Amino acid sequence: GPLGSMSCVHYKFSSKLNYDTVTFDGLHISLCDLKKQIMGREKLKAADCDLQITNAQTKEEYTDDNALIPKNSSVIVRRIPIGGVK
């Protein structure tokens, strides 16, 4: 991504063959914001699903919305159901 005041996370969706990129400010993005950006971006149903993110590099899963993903982390985005369909 643009080196400087941009912060870019390479996130590949499980539905995608490629990594996509959220450009955010700061250094890291809280999962709540990370998911909320992506859900609106890609058109996810947040009424049915939540967005489950796993790191592709460390393999760490981001379970809570407070979990933070830095631009130095390329993560995998998995769509999971909230609490209806299971």
Domain ranges of the chain: 1-86
Which tokens go with 39? Answer: 């859900």
CA–CA separation, 61 and 23 (whole Å): 21
**CA proximity to 27, closest of 76, 63, 73, 64:** 73
- Rounded distance, CA 51 to CA 9, Å? 15
Contact present, 77 and 38 (Cβ < 8 Å): yes
Determine phi and psi for 13, rounding to 5 degrees.
Answer: -85, 150
- Technique that determined the structure: NMR
Q: How many degrees, rounded to 5, is the angle at CA 65 between CA 21 and CA 46?
A: 75
Q: Which amino acid is at 40?
A: G
Pairing of strands 7-13, 75-81: parallel
For the chain, report the end-to-end CA distance as a whole number of angstroms.
Answer: 37
Distance in angstroms (rounded) separating the CA atoms of residues 73 and 62: 12
Pick the CATH number of 1-86 from 3.40.50.150, 3.50.30.40, 1.20.120.1200, 3.10.20.90: 3.10.20.90
